[PDB]
Coordinates of C-alpha atoms and ligand atoms in Angstrom, one line a residue:
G9 CA -71.3 -31.9 -31.5
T10 CA -71.7 -34.0 -28.4
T11 CA -69.5 -37.2 -28.6
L12 CA -70.7 -40.4 -26.8
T13 CA -67.8 -42.8 -26.3
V14 CA -68.6 -46.4 -25.4
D15 CA -66.2 -48.3 -23.1
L16 CA -66.7 -52.0 -23.8
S17 CA -64.2 -52.8 -20.9
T18 CA -66.6 -51.4 -18.2
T19 CA -69.6 -53.9 -18.0
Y20 CA -72.8 -54.0 -15.8
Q21 CA -75.8 -56.4 -15.9
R22 CA -77.0 -58.6 -18.8
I23 CA -80.3 -57.7 -20.5
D24 CA -82.6 -60.7 -20.9
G25 CA -85.2 -58.6 -22.8
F26 CA -88.5 -56.7 -22.8
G27 CA -92.1 -57.8 -22.9
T28 CA -95.6 -58.0 -21.6
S29 CA -98.5 -60.3 -20.8
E30 CA -101.9 -61.3 -22.2
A31 CA -103.1 -62.8 -18.9
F32 CA -106.7 -62.6 -17.5
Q33 CA -108.2 -63.3 -21.0
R34 CA -106.5 -60.4 -22.7
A35 CA -105.3 -63.1 -25.1
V36 CA -109.0 -64.0 -25.6
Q37 CA -109.7 -60.4 -26.6
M38 CA -106.9 -60.7 -29.2
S39 CA -108.3 -64.0 -30.4
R40 CA -111.8 -62.5 -31.0
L41 CA -110.4 -59.9 -33.5
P42 CA -110.7 -60.7 -37.2
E43 CA -107.6 -62.6 -38.6
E44 CA -106.1 -59.3 -40.0
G45 CA -106.4 -57.6 -36.5
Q46 CA -105.0 -60.8 -34.8
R47 CA -101.9 -60.5 -37.1
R48 CA -101.6 -56.7 -36.6
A49 CA -101.7 -57.1 -32.8
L50 CA -99.1 -59.9 -32.9
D51 CA -96.9 -58.0 -35.4
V52 CA -96.8 -54.7 -33.4
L53 CA -95.9 -56.7 -30.2
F54 CA -93.4 -59.2 -31.5
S55 CA -92.1 -58.2 -35.0
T56 CA -88.2 -57.7 -34.9
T57 CA -88.4 -55.8 -38.2
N58 CA -91.7 -53.8 -38.1
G59 CA -93.0 -53.9 -34.4
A60 CA -91.7 -53.6 -30.9
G61 CA -89.6 -56.8 -31.2
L62 CA -90.6 -57.8 -27.6
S63 CA -88.4 -60.7 -26.5
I64 CA -90.3 -62.0 -23.3
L65 CA -93.9 -63.1 -22.9
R66 CA -95.3 -63.5 -19.3
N67 CA -98.3 -65.8 -19.0
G68 CA -100.6 -66.5 -16.1
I69 CA -100.8 -70.2 -14.8
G70 CA -104.7 -70.2 -14.5
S71 CA -106.0 -70.8 -11.0
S72 CA -109.8 -70.5 -11.5
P73 CA -112.5 -73.2 -11.7
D74 CA -113.9 -71.7 -14.9
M75 CA -113.6 -68.9 -17.5
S76 CA -116.3 -66.7 -15.9
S77 CA -115.6 -62.9 -16.2
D78 CA -111.9 -62.5 -17.2
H79 CA -110.7 -65.5 -15.1
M80 CA -108.0 -67.9 -16.3
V81 CA -109.3 -71.5 -16.0
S82 CA -106.9 -73.9 -14.4
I83 CA -105.5 -77.1 -16.0
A84 CA -106.9 -78.9 -12.9
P85 CA -110.1 -77.1 -12.0
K86 CA -111.7 -80.1 -10.1
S87 CA -110.4 -81.2 -6.6
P88 CA -109.3 -84.8 -6.3
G89 CA -110.6 -84.6 -2.7
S90 CA -107.2 -85.4 -1.0
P91 CA -103.6 -84.5 -1.9
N92 CA -102.8 -88.3 -1.8
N93 CA -105.0 -88.8 -4.9
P94 CA -103.6 -88.0 -8.4
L95 CA -104.6 -84.5 -9.6
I96 CA -107.3 -84.5 -12.3
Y97 CA -106.0 -82.7 -15.4
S98 CA -108.7 -81.2 -17.7
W99 CA -106.5 -79.6 -20.5
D100 CA -108.4 -77.4 -23.0
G101 CA -105.5 -77.1 -25.5
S102 CA -105.9 -73.2 -25.1
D103 CA -104.7 -72.0 -21.6
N104 CA -107.0 -68.9 -21.9
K105 CA -105.6 -68.2 -25.5
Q106 CA -102.1 -67.7 -24.0
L107 CA -100.9 -70.9 -25.8
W108 CA -101.8 -69.4 -29.2
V109 CA -100.0 -66.0 -28.3
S110 CA -97.0 -68.1 -27.1
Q111 CA -96.9 -70.3 -30.3
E112 CA -97.0 -67.1 -32.5
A113 CA -94.4 -65.3 -30.4
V114 CA -92.0 -68.4 -30.5
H115 CA -92.6 -69.9 -34.0
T116 CA -93.6 -66.8 -36.0
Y117 CA -91.5 -64.1 -34.4
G118 CA -88.5 -66.0 -32.7
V119 CA -89.2 -65.3 -29.0
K120 CA -87.2 -67.7 -26.8
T121 CA -88.2 -66.5 -23.3
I122 CA -91.6 -67.6 -21.8
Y123 CA -92.2 -66.8 -18.2
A124 CA -95.2 -68.7 -16.7
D125 CA -96.4 -67.3 -13.3
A126 CA -99.2 -68.6 -11.0
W127 CA -101.2 -65.8 -9.2
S128 CA -102.7 -68.6 -7.0
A129 CA -102.9 -72.3 -6.5
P130 CA -106.3 -73.8 -7.3
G131 CA -108.8 -73.1 -4.5
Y132 CA -108.9 -76.7 -3.2
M133 CA -105.1 -76.4 -2.4
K134 CA -105.6 -73.3 -0.2
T135 CA -106.6 -72.4 3.4
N136 CA -109.7 -70.4 2.1
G137 CA -110.8 -73.0 -0.6
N138 CA -110.8 -70.2 -3.2
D139 CA -108.2 -69.0 -5.8
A140 CA -109.3 -65.4 -5.0
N141 CA -109.3 -63.3 -1.8
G142 CA -105.8 -64.4 -0.6
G143 CA -105.4 -67.5 1.5
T144 CA -102.3 -69.6 1.6
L145 CA -101.1 -73.0 0.1
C146 CA -102.2 -75.8 2.5
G147 CA -99.3 -77.4 4.4
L148 CA -96.9 -74.4 4.5
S149 CA -95.7 -73.4 8.0
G150 CA -98.7 -71.7 9.7
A151 CA -101.1 -73.0 7.0
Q152 CA -102.1 -76.6 8.1
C153 CA -105.4 -77.6 6.4
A154 CA -108.1 -80.2 7.4
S155 CA -108.0 -81.4 3.7
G156 CA -104.2 -82.2 3.9
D157 CA -100.7 -81.0 2.9
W158 CA -101.0 -79.8 -0.8
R159 CA -97.4 -78.5 -1.2
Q160 CA -96.1 -81.4 -3.3
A161 CA -99.4 -81.4 -5.2
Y162 CA -98.9 -77.7 -6.1
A163 CA -95.3 -78.5 -7.3
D164 CA -96.6 -81.5 -9.4
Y165 CA -99.3 -79.2 -10.8
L166 CA -96.9 -76.4 -11.9
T167 CA -94.6 -79.1 -13.4
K168 CA -97.6 -80.5 -15.4
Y169 CA -98.6 -77.0 -16.7
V170 CA -95.0 -76.7 -18.1
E171 CA -95.4 -80.3 -19.6
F172 CA -98.7 -79.3 -21.3
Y173 CA -96.9 -76.3 -22.9
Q174 CA -93.9 -78.6 -23.9
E175 CA -96.3 -81.1 -25.6
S176 CA -97.8 -78.0 -27.5
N177 CA -94.3 -77.1 -28.8
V178 CA -93.6 -74.2 -26.4
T179 CA -90.8 -74.3 -23.9
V180 CA -91.5 -72.4 -20.6
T181 CA -88.0 -71.1 -19.6
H182 CA -89.0 -69.4 -16.2
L183 CA -91.6 -70.5 -13.6
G184 CA -93.2 -68.5 -10.9
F185 CA -95.6 -69.8 -8.2
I186 CA -96.9 -66.6 -6.6
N187 CA -97.8 -63.0 -7.6
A188 CA -98.0 -60.0 -5.2
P189 CA -97.7 -62.4 -2.2
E190 CA -98.1 -59.4 0.2
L191 CA -101.6 -58.5 -1.4
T192 CA -105.1 -60.0 -0.9
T193 CA -107.4 -59.1 -3.9
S194 CA -110.9 -59.9 -5.2
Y195 CA -109.2 -61.8 -8.1
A196 CA -106.5 -64.6 -8.3
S197 CA -104.3 -63.9 -5.2
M198 CA -102.4 -66.0 -2.6
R199 CA -100.5 -64.8 0.5
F200 CA -97.0 -66.1 1.2
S201 CA -94.4 -64.7 3.5
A202 CA -90.8 -64.7 2.2
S203 CA -90.1 -67.7 4.6
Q204 CA -93.1 -69.6 3.0
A205 CA -91.7 -68.8 -0.5
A206 CA -88.3 -70.3 0.6
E207 CA -90.1 -73.4 2.1
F208 CA -92.0 -73.9 -1.2
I209 CA -88.8 -73.4 -3.4
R210 CA -87.2 -76.3 -1.4
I211 CA -90.2 -78.5 -2.6
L212 CA -90.6 -77.1 -6.2
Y213 CA -86.8 -77.3 -7.2
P214 CA -86.3 -81.1 -6.7
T215 CA -89.8 -81.6 -8.3
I216 CA -88.6 -79.8 -11.5
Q217 CA -85.1 -81.5 -11.4
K218 CA -86.7 -85.1 -11.1
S219 CA -89.4 -84.4 -13.8
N220 CA -89.5 -85.7 -17.4
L221 CA -89.5 -82.0 -18.6
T222 CA -87.2 -81.6 -21.7
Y223 CA -86.0 -78.1 -20.4
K224 CA -86.0 -77.5 -16.6
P225 CA -87.3 -74.0 -16.2
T226 CA -85.6 -71.5 -13.8
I227 CA -87.7 -70.8 -10.7
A228 CA -88.5 -67.1 -10.1
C229 CA -89.7 -65.2 -7.0
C230 CA -91.8 -63.4 -6.0
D231 CA -93.5 -60.7 -8.2
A232 CA -94.0 -58.4 -5.3
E233 CA -95.8 -55.2 -6.2
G234 CA -92.6 -53.0 -5.8
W235 CA -88.8 -53.0 -5.6
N236 CA -88.9 -52.3 -1.8
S237 CA -91.3 -55.1 -0.9
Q238 CA -89.4 -57.6 -3.1
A239 CA -86.0 -56.5 -1.6
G240 CA -87.6 -57.2 1.8
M241 CA -88.0 -60.9 0.8
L242 CA -84.4 -61.5 -0.2
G243 CA -83.1 -62.3 3.4
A244 CA -85.4 -65.4 3.7
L245 CA -84.9 -66.3 0.1
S246 CA -81.0 -66.3 0.5
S247 CA -81.1 -69.8 2.1
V248 CA -82.5 -71.1 -1.3
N249 CA -80.3 -69.1 -3.8
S250 CA -79.0 -72.5 -5.1
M251 CA -82.6 -73.5 -6.0
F252 CA -84.0 -70.5 -7.9
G253 CA -82.5 -68.2 -10.5
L254 CA -84.6 -65.1 -11.1
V255 CA -85.9 -62.2 -8.9
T256 CA -89.1 -60.5 -10.1
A257 CA -90.9 -57.4 -8.9
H258 CA -93.3 -54.8 -10.2
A259 CA -93.3 -51.0 -10.2
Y260 CA -96.5 -50.1 -8.3
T261 CA -95.8 -49.8 -4.5
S262 CA -92.3 -48.4 -5.1
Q263 CA -90.1 -47.7 -8.2
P264 CA -87.0 -49.6 -9.4
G265 CA -84.5 -46.9 -8.3
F266 CA -81.8 -49.0 -6.5
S267 CA -79.9 -52.3 -7.0
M268 CA -81.3 -55.2 -5.1
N269 CA -78.8 -57.3 -3.0
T270 CA -79.2 -60.7 -4.8
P271 CA -76.9 -62.8 -7.0
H272 CA -79.8 -63.4 -9.5
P273 CA -80.9 -61.3 -12.5
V274 CA -83.8 -59.0 -11.5
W275 CA -86.7 -58.5 -13.8
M276 CA -89.3 -55.7 -13.6
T277 CA -92.2 -57.9 -14.6
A278 CA -95.2 -55.4 -14.5
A279 CA -95.6 -51.7 -14.7
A280 CA -98.3 -49.4 -16.2
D281 CA -100.3 -46.2 -15.8
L282 CA -103.3 -48.3 -14.6
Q283 CA -105.7 -45.4 -13.8
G284 CA -104.7 -42.9 -16.5
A285 CA -107.2 -42.0 -19.4
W286 CA -105.9 -43.5 -22.7
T287 CA -103.3 -41.5 -24.5
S288 CA -101.4 -42.6 -27.7
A289 CA -99.0 -39.5 -27.5
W290 CA -95.3 -39.7 -27.2
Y291 CA -95.0 -36.3 -25.5
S292 CA -97.5 -33.7 -24.2
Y293 CA -96.1 -32.6 -20.8
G294 CA -94.4 -35.7 -19.3
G295 CA -97.6 -37.1 -17.9
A296 CA -97.9 -40.7 -16.5
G297 CA -99.2 -42.3 -19.8
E298 CA -96.9 -40.7 -22.3
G299 CA -94.5 -42.7 -24.5
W300 CA -91.6 -40.3 -23.5
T301 CA -92.4 -41.0 -19.8
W302 CA -92.3 -44.8 -20.3
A303 CA -89.0 -44.6 -22.4
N304 CA -87.5 -42.9 -19.3
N305 CA -89.2 -45.4 -16.8
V306 CA -87.3 -48.2 -18.7
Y307 CA -84.1 -46.2 -18.5
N308 CA -84.5 -45.7 -14.8
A309 CA -85.2 -49.4 -14.1
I310 CA -82.1 -50.5 -16.1
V311 CA -79.6 -47.8 -15.0
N312 CA -80.8 -47.1 -11.4
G313 CA -82.8 -50.4 -10.6
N314 CA -80.1 -52.7 -12.2
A315 CA -83.0 -54.5 -14.0
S316 CA -82.2 -57.3 -16.6
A317 CA -85.7 -57.1 -18.1
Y318 CA -88.7 -54.7 -18.3
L319 CA -92.3 -55.9 -19.0
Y320 CA -95.3 -53.6 -19.3
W321 CA -98.4 -55.0 -17.6
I322 CA -100.5 -55.8 -20.7
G323 CA -99.8 -55.7 -24.4
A324 CA -103.1 -55.5 -26.3
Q325 CA -106.5 -55.1 -24.6
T326 CA -109.8 -53.3 -24.9
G327 CA -110.6 -50.4 -22.6
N328 CA -110.0 -46.6 -22.1
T329 CA -107.0 -46.6 -19.6
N330 CA -103.2 -46.8 -20.0
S331 CA -103.1 -50.3 -18.4
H332 CA -102.0 -51.6 -21.8
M333 CA -99.8 -50.6 -24.8
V334 CA -102.0 -51.5 -27.7
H335 CA -105.7 -50.5 -28.0
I336 CA -108.3 -53.1 -29.3
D337 CA -111.6 -51.8 -30.6
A338 CA -113.6 -55.1 -30.3
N339 CA -116.6 -53.8 -32.4
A340 CA -114.5 -52.3 -35.3
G341 CA -111.7 -55.0 -35.2
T342 CA -109.0 -52.3 -35.1
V343 CA -105.6 -52.3 -33.4
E344 CA -104.0 -49.0 -32.4
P345 CA -100.5 -49.0 -30.8
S346 CA -99.7 -46.2 -28.3
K347 CA -96.3 -44.5 -28.2
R348 CA -95.8 -46.6 -25.0
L349 CA -95.6 -49.6 -27.3
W350 CA -93.0 -47.8 -29.5
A351 CA -91.1 -46.6 -26.3
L352 CA -90.6 -50.3 -25.2
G353 CA -89.8 -51.2 -28.9
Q354 CA -87.2 -48.5 -29.2
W355 CA -85.4 -50.5 -26.5
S356 CA -86.3 -54.1 -27.4
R357 CA -85.6 -53.9 -31.2
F358 CA -81.9 -53.1 -30.6
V359 CA -81.1 -54.3 -27.1
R360 CA -81.5 -58.1 -27.8
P361 CA -81.5 -60.9 -25.2
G362 CA -78.0 -61.5 -23.8
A363 CA -76.8 -57.9 -24.3
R364 CA -74.4 -56.6 -21.7
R365 CA -74.8 -53.0 -20.5
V366 CA -71.5 -51.1 -20.9
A367 CA -70.3 -47.6 -19.9
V368 CA -70.9 -44.6 -22.2
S369 CA -69.5 -41.1 -21.5
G370 CA -69.9 -37.6 -22.9
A371 CA -73.6 -36.9 -22.5
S372 CA -74.5 -33.1 -22.3
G373 CA -77.3 -31.9 -19.8
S374 CA -80.3 -32.6 -22.1
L375 CA -79.1 -36.2 -23.0
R376 CA -79.5 -39.3 -20.9
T377 CA -77.5 -42.2 -22.4
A378 CA -76.9 -45.9 -21.9
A379 CA -75.0 -48.5 -24.1
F380 CA -75.4 -52.2 -24.7
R381 CA -73.1 -54.8 -26.3
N382 CA -75.2 -57.4 -28.0
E383 CA -74.1 -61.1 -28.2
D384 CA -73.4 -60.5 -32.0
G385 CA -71.0 -57.6 -31.1
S386 CA -73.4 -54.8 -32.3
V387 CA -73.3 -51.9 -29.8
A388 CA -76.7 -50.1 -29.2
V389 CA -76.4 -46.6 -27.8
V390 CA -79.7 -45.2 -26.3
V391 CA -80.0 -41.4 -26.4
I392 CA -83.0 -39.8 -24.6
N393 CA -83.1 -36.1 -25.6
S394 CA -85.2 -33.7 -23.6
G395 CA -83.9 -30.7 -25.6
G396 CA -84.0 -29.6 -29.3
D397 CA -82.4 -31.4 -32.2
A398 CA -78.9 -32.5 -31.0
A399 CA -75.9 -33.3 -33.3
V400 CA -74.3 -36.4 -31.7
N401 CA -71.2 -38.5 -32.6
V402 CA -71.1 -42.1 -31.4
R403 CA -67.9 -44.0 -31.2
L404 CA -66.1 -46.8 -29.2
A405 CA -63.2 -45.8 -26.8
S406 CA -59.8 -45.7 -28.6
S407 CA -58.7 -48.7 -26.4
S408 CA -61.2 -50.9 -28.3
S409 CA -59.6 -53.7 -30.5
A410 CA -59.8 -52.7 -34.2
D411 CA -62.2 -55.7 -34.9
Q412 CA -64.7 -54.5 -32.2
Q413 CA -64.9 -51.2 -34.2
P414 CA -67.9 -50.7 -36.4
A415 CA -67.8 -51.2 -40.2
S416 CA -71.3 -49.7 -40.4
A417 CA -74.0 -47.9 -38.4
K418 CA -77.7 -47.3 -38.4
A419 CA -80.0 -45.2 -36.2
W420 CA -83.7 -45.1 -35.4
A421 CA -85.8 -42.6 -33.5
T422 CA -89.2 -42.5 -31.8
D423 CA -90.9 -39.1 -31.0
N424 CA -94.3 -37.4 -31.6
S425 CA -94.1 -38.0 -35.4
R426 CA -91.8 -41.2 -35.7
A427 CA -92.4 -44.8 -34.6
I428 CA -88.9 -46.5 -34.6
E429 CA -88.2 -44.7 -37.8
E430 CA -84.7 -45.0 -39.4
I431 CA -82.8 -41.7 -39.4
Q432 CA -79.4 -40.8 -41.0
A433 CA -76.3 -42.3 -39.4
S434 CA -73.4 -40.8 -41.4
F435 CA -70.5 -43.2 -40.8
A436 CA -66.8 -42.0 -41.0
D437 CA -63.8 -44.2 -39.9
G438 CA -65.6 -45.8 -36.9
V439 CA -67.8 -42.7 -35.9
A440 CA -71.6 -42.5 -36.4
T441 CA -72.9 -38.9 -36.7
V442 CA -76.6 -38.5 -36.0
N443 CA -79.1 -35.6 -35.6
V444 CA -81.0 -36.8 -32.5
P445 CA -84.5 -35.3 -32.8
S446 CA -86.1 -33.0 -30.3
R447 CA -87.8 -34.8 -27.3
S448 CA -86.9 -38.3 -28.8
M449 CA -85.5 -41.6 -27.9
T450 CA -82.9 -42.4 -30.5
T451 CA -80.9 -45.7 -30.7
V452 CA -77.6 -45.7 -32.6
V453 CA -76.2 -49.1 -33.5
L454 CA -72.6 -49.7 -34.4
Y455 CA -72.1 -52.9 -36.3
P456 CA -68.8 -54.7 -36.6
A457 CA -67.8 -56.3 -40.0
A458 CA -68.4 -59.9 -38.5
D459 CA -68.1 -62.4 -41.4
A460 CA -69.0 -59.8 -44.2
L461 CA -66.4 -58.8 -46.8
Ligands
LIG1 C1 -76.8 -56.1 -11.0 O1 -77.4 -57.3 -11.3 C2 -76.5 -58.3 -11.7 C3 -77.3 -59.5 -12.0 O2 -78.1 -59.3 -13.2 C4 -75.6 -58.6 -10.5 O3 -74.6 -59.6 -10.9 C5 -74.3 -60.6 -9.9 O4 -73.2 -60.2 -9.2 C6 -72.9 -61.2 -8.2 C7 -71.9 -60.4 -7.3 O5 -70.7 -60.3 -8.1 C8 -72.4 -62.4 -8.9 O6 -72.1 -63.4 -7.9 C9 -71.0 -64.3 -8.2 O7 -71.4 -65.4 -8.9 C10 -70.4 -66.3 -9.2 C11 -71.0 -67.4 -10.0 O8 -71.5 -66.9 -11.2 C12 -71.7 -67.9 -12.1 O9 -72.8 -68.7 -11.9 C13 -74.0 -68.0 -11.8 C14 -75.1 -68.9 -11.3 O10 -75.3 -69.9 -12.4 C15 -76.5 -70.6 -12.2 O11 -77.6 -69.9 -12.7 C16 -77.6 -69.6 -14.1 C17 -78.9 -69.0 -14.6 O12 -80.0 -69.4 -13.7 C18 -77.4 -70.9 -15.0 O13 -77.2 -70.5 -16.3 C19 -76.2 -71.7 -14.5 O14 -76.3 -73.0 -15.1 C20 -76.4 -71.9 -13.0 O15 -77.5 -72.8 -12.8 C21 -77.0 -73.9 -11.9 O16 -76.8 -73.5 -10.6 C22 -78.0 -73.1 -9.9 C23 -77.5 -72.7 -8.5 O17 -76.8 -71.5 -8.5 C24 -79.1 -74.1 -9.9 O18 -80.3 -73.6 -9.3 C25 -79.3 -74.6 -11.3 O19 -80.3 -75.7 -11.4 C26 -78.0 -75.0 -12.0 O20 -77.5 -76.2 -11.4 C27 -74.3 -67.3 -13.1 O21 -75.5 -66.5 -13.0 C28 -73.1 -66.5 -13.5 O22 -73.4 -66.0 -14.8 C29 -72.9 -64.6 -15.0 O23 -71.5 -64.7 -15.4 C30 -71.3 -65.4 -16.6 C31 -69.8 -65.6 -16.8 O24 -69.3 -64.3 -17.0 C32 -72.0 -64.6 -17.7 O25 -71.9 -65.2 -19.0 C33 -73.5 -64.6 -17.4 O26 -74.2 -63.9 -18.4 C34 -73.7 -64.0 -16.0 O27 -73.4 -62.6 -16.1 C35 -71.8 -67.3 -13.5 O28 -71.9 -68.4 -14.4 C36 -69.7 -66.8 -7.9 O29 -68.6 -67.7 -8.3 C37 -69.2 -65.6 -7.1 O30 -68.6 -66.1 -5.9 C38 -67.2 -65.9 -5.7 O31 -66.9 -64.5 -5.3 C39 -67.4 -64.1 -4.1 C40 -67.2 -62.6 -3.7 O32 -67.7 -61.8 -4.7 C41 -66.9 -65.0 -3.0 O33 -67.4 -64.5 -1.7 C42 -67.2 -66.4 -3.3 O34 -66.7 -67.3 -2.3 C43 -66.8 -66.9 -4.7 O35 -65.4 -67.2 -4.8 C44 -64.8 -68.0 -5.7 O36 -64.5 -67.3 -6.9 C45 -63.7 -66.1 -6.7 C46 -63.5 -65.4 -8.1 O37 -63.5 -64.0 -7.9 C47 -62.4 -66.5 -6.1 O38 -61.7 -65.2 -5.7 C48 -62.6 -67.3 -4.8 O39 -61.3 -67.9 -4.4 C49 -63.6 -68.4 -4.9 O40 -63.0 -69.5 -5.5 C50 -70.3 -64.7 -6.9 O41 -71.3 -65.3 -6.0 C51 -73.5 -63.0 -9.8 O42 -73.0 -64.1 -10.6 C52 -74.0 -61.9 -10.7 N1 -75.1 -62.5 -11.4 C53 -75.2 -62.5 -12.7 C54 -76.5 -63.0 -13.3 O43 -74.3 -62.1 -13.5 C55 -74.8 -57.3 -10.0 O44 -74.1 -57.5 -8.8 C56 -75.9 -56.2 -9.8 N2 -75.2 -55.0 -9.5 C57 -75.2 -54.3 -8.4 C58 -74.4 -53.1 -8.4 O45 -75.9 -54.7 -7.5
LIG2 O1 -108.9 -56.9 -14.8 C1 -108.1 -57.2 -13.7 C2 -106.9 -56.3 -13.7 O2 -107.3 -54.9 -13.5 C3 -105.8 -56.7 -12.8 O3 -104.8 -55.8 -12.6 C4 -104.4 -55.5 -11.3 C5 -104.9 -54.1 -10.9 O4 -104.4 -53.8 -9.6 C6 -102.9 -53.7 -9.6 O5 -102.5 -53.5 -8.3 C7 -102.5 -52.1 -8.0 C8 -101.1 -51.5 -8.2 O6 -101.1 -50.2 -7.9 C9 -101.4 -50.0 -6.5 O7 -101.3 -48.6 -6.2 C10 -100.1 -48.1 -5.6 C11 -100.1 -48.4 -4.1 O8 -98.8 -48.0 -3.6 C12 -98.7 -46.6 -3.7 O9 -97.4 -46.2 -3.1 C13 -97.4 -46.1 -1.7 C14 -97.4 -44.6 -1.3 O10 -97.4 -44.4 0.1 C15 -96.2 -44.9 0.7 O11 -96.1 -44.6 2.0 C16 -96.1 -46.4 0.5 O12 -94.9 -46.9 1.0 C17 -96.2 -46.7 -1.0 O13 -96.2 -48.1 -1.1 C18 -98.7 -46.1 -5.1 O14 -98.7 -44.7 -5.2 C19 -99.9 -46.6 -5.9 O15 -99.8 -46.4 -7.2 C20 -102.8 -50.5 -6.2 O16 -103.1 -50.3 -4.8 C21 -103.0 -51.9 -6.6 O17 -104.3 -52.3 -6.5 C22 -102.4 -55.1 -10.0 O18 -100.9 -55.0 -10.1 C23 -102.9 -55.5 -11.3 O19 -102.4 -56.9 -11.6 O20 -105.5 -58.1 -12.8 C24 -106.7 -58.9 -12.6 C25 -107.7 -58.6 -13.7 O21 -108.8 -59.5 -13.5
LIG3 O1 -85.0 -47.9 -45.8 C1 -86.0 -48.8 -45.3 C2 -86.3 -48.4 -43.8 O2 -86.9 -47.2 -43.7 C3 -87.1 -49.5 -43.1 O3 -87.2 -49.1 -41.8 C4 -88.3 -49.8 -41.1 C5 -89.6 -49.1 -41.4 O4 -90.7 -49.7 -40.6 C6 -90.5 -49.6 -39.2 O5 -91.5 -50.3 -38.5 C7 -92.8 -49.5 -38.6 C8 -93.1 -49.0 -37.3 O6 -94.3 -48.1 -37.3 C9 -95.4 -48.9 -37.7 O7 -96.5 -48.0 -37.9 C10 -96.9 -47.2 -36.8 C11 -98.2 -47.8 -36.2 O8 -98.6 -47.0 -35.0 C12 -98.9 -45.7 -35.3 O9 -99.2 -45.1 -34.1 C13 -97.8 -45.0 -36.0 O10 -98.2 -43.7 -36.5 C14 -97.2 -45.7 -37.2 O11 -96.1 -45.1 -37.8 C15 -95.2 -49.7 -39.0 O12 -96.3 -50.5 -39.3 C16 -93.9 -50.4 -39.1 O13 -93.7 -50.9 -40.4 C17 -89.2 -50.2 -38.8 O14 -89.0 -49.9 -37.4 C18 -88.0 -49.7 -39.6 O15 -86.8 -50.4 -39.3 O16 -86.6 -50.8 -43.3 C19 -86.4 -51.2 -44.6 C20 -85.5 -50.2 -45.3 O17 -85.4 -50.7 -46.7

């Protein structure tokens, strides 16, 4: 058959993981399900045995004065009048039901990475006095406000949000202070130039470092709406590379098809078929909503975009578009995962946080392949097959040390009839032999002996 040979001596980027968000009250929609539906939604998103095993949760740091519409209410919704006055914290113990999703992800399912990102400062900290319709943080260069300089106040505010999570037994590991800073919208939005982002990082970094936080989160920037627009910000950010540790961008205004010039890991923190009519299918024709298409979008972001993480926009939500991976029927209390959920899971279940991408060779024309060395020494080989059933052999390069060689192997596939379903991995003297199904994403995992006799 086709032999795929993994070269552990040729390494690329680290994989931090895969995930999604329940921002803008999508967590509230989950919380309104019956207890059984709540558990099924959480299981399909986070279960490492029977769901997508998503390893990252991205939360919104609420900017709004109330929970009107789908707004995320701020921890400090009321202005103290002046930035000289202590901020007025009005904690609701909920954070728009994201705290509950976070507590389940961490304490029930073992998630260790929690990315909190503000779309806006509270309106009283901004040039336009509103968390929506753009505007800029008061006190930045070119944004001097009558009300005063709110830059330190915003840093104190973000630090306090992380502290409220910490006191609710969730560690925020990564912290963002803008989203789509090039875009004014009718919802939470805030305009920063790349130079303004650098200016604010110089204020936020020492604020975090001097804080009483148990774990100092890594600062991220800037959740631009595409690879091209985020890459355009890196020049101005380069003066503060010592003060942040994560580059973030979405896949809307351009695709993650090149490696950004930055020393930091790069995360693709939001993508979706936002406009597309709901489909649950894995493959119909390669349309924008199909699970097959999304398995390939992840492949492209990692292999071509040099991404260390991949987050779909929303996990579970109501509504009839492909903005989300898991459909909620609010009336019926039902939860239906799309094959986009299983696409991301077919990655996330087997490519665990800290995995190192490694070279794999031997792919025929209908196969696209990638390989990952997990921290535990298990080697996950991704095979995306556009053709018919394909007989594949999976092995390490002969130069591998004998104790890196597998003692066992398993395989799982997702396709039109399978959701991360185990398939036969016949194992002979270090070689896994697998029938990769037609139009599937198959992951073959080679397991060393480790401490087992
Ligand atoms: C695809 O994406 C990849 C990223 O996902 C990308 O990889 C990046 O490649 C660049 C280019 O090669 C690498 O840049 C080098 O980095 C070396 C330092 O690396 C170590 O430190 C990094 C930063 O660590 C901070 O951040 C971490 C996470 O936030 C924390 O865990 C740390 O605690 C630390 O935080 C602290 O510091 C912060 C300030 O930085 C601060 O805010 C914070 O509060 C805190 O105080 C780590 O990320 C990095 O980790 C990697 O490697 C380790 C070890 O293997 C792995 O375990 C990790 O998993 C991870 O992969 C390291 O710990 C620099 O030393 C190096 O500079 C030297 O070489 C250049 C030329 O290339 C010289 O110009 C320069 O002068 C330096 O010279 C010195 O050393 C050389 C040795 O060759 C020597 O010859 C010379 O004489 C001199 O003494 C360079 O900058 C970058 O690290 C990669 N990032 C990552 C994440 O791996 C890749 O390029 C992309 N691919 C493509 C094709 O684009
Ligand atoms: O309920 C609310 C949620 O809906 C909400 O979600 C936000 C919805 O809007 C999202 O932003 C959209 C992202 O997609 C963009 O369309 C892109 C635009 O760029 C095009 O590419 C260009 C093509 O032409 C070239 O010359 C040019 O260089 C390219 O850039 C691309 O083809 C389109 O797909 C929309 O314009 C955005 O509106 C946003 O990310 C979501 O967060 O959140 C709030 C909640 O209340
Ligand atoms: O030998 C046993 C193995 O077979 C078993 O493998 C696991 C079996 O469960 C797998 O997780 C599945 C994933 O699919 C879920 O159901 C889907 C829900 O969405 C629908 O669209 C779709 O049609 C359904 O199939 C299911 O709830 C969940 O359990 C898991 O990935 C396999 O590893 O492990 C135990 C062995 O003893």
